[PDB]
Amino acid sequence: SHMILVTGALGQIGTELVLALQEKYGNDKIIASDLKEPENYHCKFEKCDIRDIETYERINNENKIEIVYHLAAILSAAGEKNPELCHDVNYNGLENVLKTAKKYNQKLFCPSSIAVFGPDVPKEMTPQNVELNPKTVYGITKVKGEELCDTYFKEHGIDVRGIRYPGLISWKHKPSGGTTDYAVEMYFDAVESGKYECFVNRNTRLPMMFMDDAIRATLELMDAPLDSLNYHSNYNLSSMSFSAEELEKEISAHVDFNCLYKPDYRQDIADTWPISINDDDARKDWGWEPKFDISKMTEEMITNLRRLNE
Template sequence: MSEISRILVIGALGQIGSELTPALRQRYGADNVVAADIREAKGTPLAEDGPYEICDVTDRTRIDRLITGYKIDCIANMAALLSAVGEKVPQKCWEVNINGLVNTLEAAREHELKQVFCPSSIAVFGPNTPRDSTPQETVLEPTTMYGVTKVSGELLCHYYHLRFGVDARGLRYPGIISSETLPGGGTTDYAVEIFYKAIEDGHYDCFVREDTMLPMMYMPDCIKATMDLLAAPREKLMHRSNYNVAAISFTAGELAAEITKHLPEFTIDYKPDERQAYADSWPRTIDDRIAREEWGWTPAYDLAAMTKDMLEVLTKRQAAGALYAG
């Protein structure tokens, strides 16, 4: 089948969608990538650099209209409620993450789209999963509603491929660290907040313990992984909807120490809250050999390179009086 050419990104205003959409527009052409979200985006680059539409992922009729109107052949479904938010409203988390995904898969089946992309997460793992070098195939018994939706989502994508031939692809993203859009309420948000607070206040109250180690990835690697999987030849993909992808694993203490190399006055206190339990149920490190073998995944950023880049970007923005402008 020929390559995808017209993409609908639902959840485009989020932490990942807001950087994935411009990257897709650069590769596939600005007019060929429709950004959509449940929120207004007037005046933002996403709304000005290409088509922008309001779309609730739970509204199937709206998705159908956008597919027909824009001759869409691929949906990237980035709309979701993440772990910490999802645990506050678990029923809503199921509705958006699962009913929304079923809508995109059904739309892909009926309109014979070439591809659907829907991210999974390290939240598919749970306390019974090996936490070090977590394998691709392992125990998936999450203890958060978010994790339950992500396991179910992987299975749904797999089912739609087997049963209906829908080319549904997905990655188990680790915690994503980025400087453009603030994260939307996940457990790994501390690894982003710490940079803003280090620059703004010289101090951060961290909501997980110092020894908490989780798998993380810098946004340029997240975008690269996503674009590479979207462009991978269909016949090479055996796992398709649930690839482990690893980049960097570090403890909260190691991240703070790395920041201190650049900002020696920086201080941190550890005040674990309910998110500690979610973090404790997730892996420390990930085995991503399958992604490397099947479609050539390799990350570029380690802890030192990511920290240096984050601090440079945010320091420049603060000097321009727009630390939170992203």
């Protein structure tokens, strides 16, 4: 019963989230936005740079937007290579979203990342409330973003919600600017060729989640009654934790492939992140439970990628 805008709509999450929202609420309620207008695209679409407050505001007020799912960002690897761009898009873009929400009395979904954490806090089952001392440019943007969001909630009364997503795995839109991207790439290349060159070492172990779980978590959190929530911008959220070679082994149980490990600069990013996450507060406050383990995710990835390679 509300007009919804999705920023970053053409990216890894947005490709799936826009369709989920159209189905849940109707096509007449969803507006998609990103930098460049796509050909052959069903959802209504408005182009915008998230840093352009004038155009962003216009899209919001001309479409009577009441809820924003804010996915626009620069991710961890692209951001480490261009730190000024990363700050500008992630922090100034978020501030534009928040200022607009305050003007127009909007509800928001503004995600964070497991990149908020650094190596000074536990790597296993990282708690919700530990200090956030990230060692990446992108992680610092996400910490600043959490704090800005929580100011807008407390000071300004804006109902902004967010999740520290783990690495997300999907087949519909292959990622290209992150660090957890190896997991997707490994699926794609295993099925397309039976070989992969992995950009992290074989023991790299990170929190991961299948996209259907991440999308469902997003929608469930957004549907929760506000008074049930003890956290706002920054829920920890968990599903899986595995190493690169463990994923290789799972994939190899379906298709012949062999993986070679050739780390690059993204190792130095991954090394600074936890292995797994304590998401009790999500599970307690709003009933989170993941549904896809590594086996089930692998079946879905491989079946769809095989189809796409026919």
